[PDB]
Design a protein around this ligand. Sequence first.
Ligand code: NA
Lengths: 449, 436
Amino acid sequence: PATPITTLQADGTHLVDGYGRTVLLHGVNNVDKDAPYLPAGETLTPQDIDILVRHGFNTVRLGTSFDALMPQRGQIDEAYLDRLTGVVDALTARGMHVLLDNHQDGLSKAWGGNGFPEWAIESRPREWEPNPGFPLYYLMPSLNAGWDEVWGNTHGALDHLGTALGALAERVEGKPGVMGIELLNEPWPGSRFLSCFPNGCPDFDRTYQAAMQKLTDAVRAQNPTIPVYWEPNVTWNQMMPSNLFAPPVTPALTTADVVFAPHDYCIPSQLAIYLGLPQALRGLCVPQQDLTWSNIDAITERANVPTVITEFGDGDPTVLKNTLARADERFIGWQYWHFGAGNATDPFLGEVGRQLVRTYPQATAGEPGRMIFDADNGDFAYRFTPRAATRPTEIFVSDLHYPDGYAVQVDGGQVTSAPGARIVTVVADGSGPVTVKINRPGSAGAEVP
Amino acid sequence: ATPITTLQADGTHLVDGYGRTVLLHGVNNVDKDAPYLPGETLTPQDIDILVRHGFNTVRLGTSFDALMPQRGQIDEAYLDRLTGVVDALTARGMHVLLDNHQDGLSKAWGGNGFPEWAIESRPREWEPNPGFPLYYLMPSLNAGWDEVWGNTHGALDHLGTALGALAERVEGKPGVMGIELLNEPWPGSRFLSCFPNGCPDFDRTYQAAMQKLTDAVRAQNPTIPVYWEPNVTWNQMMPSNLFAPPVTPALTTADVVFAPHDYCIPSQLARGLCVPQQDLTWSNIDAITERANVPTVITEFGDPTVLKNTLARADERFIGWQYWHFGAGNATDPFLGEVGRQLVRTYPQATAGEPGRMIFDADNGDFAYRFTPRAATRPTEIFVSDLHYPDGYAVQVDGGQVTSAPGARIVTVVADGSGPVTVKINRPGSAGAEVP
Ligand code: NA
């Protein structure tokens, strides 16, 4: 008997559900980059979705795009919206919070990327300019002039984008399982990107924040309560800090329900994958990703908004811990890149899934305290401070880590779920802190950090 | 009398006028601010330091700007001064590599090298300039490089004249080992074609440009060796397509030396973290060596622990080098700390034969070396580190004998016959090194 899915609302740095519980989201990215978009038979199957439910994921970052939404100048593709809604509904029916991502890579199909429709951008690459594809194409001069058109709104691309996202916002209005709209994936600053190095770009981020505010206002004009997800400009991925929400340099955040949506990639891992550079360079992943997390902490203290890591991993099992442990430390949720449709086999049964599939509190009737999960043996410990809520604390128990079943101990509360249950439910004894341990029956278990 | 001689490429070897194979260990002396100093002259004591530590080469900086400060006009006074410095260095046994230096194309970008008159492109008022090294991504700087490779306003023609005048000037100076045609050449607007695995098409253009400059040099000084760098996407781990048939022409020009740099990106952003890049760089050097059969000198490199990687890989291949951080006006000997313990080394400066394997332990001074004797008019000369043997050194030779004095800075070795010669040098009482 599943808990009905509800809207999520930003309360300071937490996301809270309709029952008053603090929610932790773990899930995946599912993005269709190529037209035709979401064609019949090539979207997530009932089987794919069962895999996500089986492994306890409660969120999907679902790709949409400007091109898919408005494939001709000023004309919304309503048939595409029907197909997109079909996928959203299939996911939310099974307890998945769906984040709608206005995806792009390398601006447009004109550069061999995706996102913006060709009709909306004047710039084109010449036959002579080398195109190394992802991610180096961001250094192509024509692609840069493309982004200049966007940030300058030179030919009304932002105006049209606002209309497109407004139409999307309107179509999903009233669906509680839609967790928000992410306004733009990996925004490139265009021709003045070098001003972001070596320590960020205040002036561009002012331009960028104004553009995101405009898109937010367009969304909220059609759907006044839907959360909006704002990424840092993508020089973030080359260790450069964000200057979002930093008065007096950039405006204070005056819009409600805004969530910070950074990515957490290891540079040497990405360069190994896309350039074929030595994998052994991943020795530097830890200090570099620590810097990203330090940057996230800065936004958190400054803006007091929630954060979701909307992309990480990209198939590399060695870097996952860097995101997972630091995310657990701050009680921050995440979406793994990437989970494709039409799986003939379960892709979470190897090295990646052993770390992604975890025992974790999906919803806490209280303020989260410290948490730990040992991805080798399944040891789990969690402490929180109870608050009044209309549902109990729900903890998903990994289907991979406990072959001989699992044991549960609670201090300051009771387990109300059945032995061997997929979800552990905990009710607090009173106002005092609650401590939960879950582990293999023969394990001594973990302590709360 | 064993005066300094010219060096001649014989396949992979550099061979002196006495028939000996030469290994070069030394330093850079390159200063962009030389025109404002009363310039690049090393003090007699600076040179003492180099001599005391066994260094036998200096990469001496020059520039297109200094050689030709107005359109089409050579600075003969500057050439007089430069020649003065060359003579002082060669008189003390230093082989001088003349380095046509640049960084960021020009002073117009906050760089150095090409004179401003030679380049049309200029940075725009709005255009962000992050300085070295990221200024190489500035559109205007890239357009500047396009003028060079396209020769769109004759800048390569003028550079040829400038380097030709330099070459003319040093004709008949044996201690000049060559002219390095251009430091860290940037491909300009086609640099993205060099990723993810090199740019054969651009390197075809680059190779033809280097050949053009080589022709301009050789027309004034027909025997002077020329040193060709790979295009600088090399420093971002991309391989060179120099001398790579069928896509670029085979090497058909005599006395060309390959001149790569060995730098570690991870360092900039203690050794282990640099190994992946350095192994890649050195396998890229091996590719060139194997296909082109030319010598290589590491004309720039330089955390003391990361040096150990470079030095070991250079020793493995019997490849020489010039360390970057050296300068004029040393108040103190800069080789007496951790860097110098690695750079100051017991090594064979000149071998009367074909070098075999060589090993130097920079912690305790253990040294071993084998070679096959050949006909030569001078003996093998091994410099002995002045830092690693506080209680003196012991020497043993199989298949030959030592002719120098106990405690001498140079060990001289004469072969007994045609059989291999093995030399061991170490602290007294040490079991010493063994030949790999
Ligand atoms: Na598709």
